[PDB]
Swiss-Prot record:
It comes from Conus victoriae. The modification Cysteine amide is found at residue 16. Alpha-conotoxins act on postsynaptic membranes, they bind to the nicotinic acetylcholine receptors (nAChR) and thus inhibit them. This toxin (native toxin Vc1a; hydroxylated and gamma-carboxylated) blocks alpha-9-alpha-10/CHRNA9-CHRNA10 nAChRs (IC(50)=62.9 nM). In contrast to the non-post-translationally modified analog Vc1.1, Vc1a does not inhibit high voltage-activated (HVA) calcium channel currents. In vivo, in contrast to Vc1.1, Vc1a does not show analgesic effects in rat models of neuropathic pain. This is Alpha-conotoxin Vc1a. Changing residue 9 to K: In non-hydroxylated and non-gamma-carboxylated analog; complete loss of potency of inhibition of rat alpha-9-alpha-10/CHRNA9-CHRNA10 nAChR. No change in potency of inhibition of HVA calcium channels in rat/mouse DRG neurons. Its main location: secreted. The modification 4-carboxyglutamate is found at residue 14. Changing residue 13 to D/K: In non-hydroxylated and non-gamma-carboxylated analog; complete loss of potency of inhibition of rat alpha-9-alpha-10/CHRNA9-CHRNA10 nAChR. Decrease in potency of inhibition of HVA calcium channels in rat/mouse DRG neurons. Residues 5-7, 11-15 are annotated as: Key region for inhibition of alpha-9-alpha-10/CHRNA9-CHRNA10 nAChR. Residues 4-6 are annotated as: Ser-Xaa-Pro motif, crucial for potent interaction with nAChR. The synthetic peptide Vc1.1 (a non-hydroxylated and non-gamma-carboxylated analog of Vc1a) shows weak inhibition on nAChRs composed of alpha-3-alpha-5-beta-2/CHRNA3-CHRNA5-CHRNB2 (IC(50)=7.2 uM), alpha-3-beta-2/CHRNA3-CHRNB2 (IC(50)=5.5-7.3 uM), alpha-3-beta-4/CHRNA3-CHRNB4 (IC(50)=4.2 uM), alpha-3-alpha-5-beta-4/CHRNA3-CHRNA5-CHRNB4 (IC(50)>30 uM), alpha-4-beta-2/CHRNA4-CHRNB2 (IC(50)>30 uM), alpha-4-beta-4/CHRNA4-CHRNB4 (IC(50)>30 uM), rat alpha-7/CHRNA7 (IC(50)=7.1 uM) and alpha-1-beta-1-gamma-delta/CHRNA1-CHRNB1-CHRNG-CHRND (IC(50)>30 uM) subunits. cVc1.1 is a cyclic peptide with inhibitory activity on alpha-9-alpha-10/CHRNA9-CHRNA10 nAChRs (IC(50)=766 nM) and a high potency at inhibiting HVA calcium channels in mice DRG neurons (IC(50)=0.3 nM). Toxin cVc1.1[D11A; E14A] is a cyclic peptide with a very low inhibitory activity on alpha-9-alpha-10/CHRNA9-CHRNA10 nAChRs (IC(50)>17 uM) and a high potency at inhibiting HVA calcium channels in mice DRG neurons (IC(50)=3.3 nM). Both of them show antinociceptive actions, with greater efficacy in a model of animal chronic visceral hypersensitivity (CVH). Keywords: Acetylcholine receptor inhibiting toxin, Amidation, Cleavage on pair of basic residues, Disulfide bond, G-protein coupled receptor impairing toxin, Gamma-carboxyglutamic acid, Hydroxylation, Ion channel impairing toxin, Neurotoxin, Pharmaceutical, Postsynaptic neurotoxin, Secreted, Signal, Toxin.
Length: 16
């Protein structure tokens, strides 16, 4: 989910 969302991907780089 979030990892597929620029909003999360950039907020949670650690995971992405």
């Amino acid at each position: 989910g979030a990892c597929s969302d620029p909003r999360a991907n950039y907020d949670h780089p650690e995971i992405c």
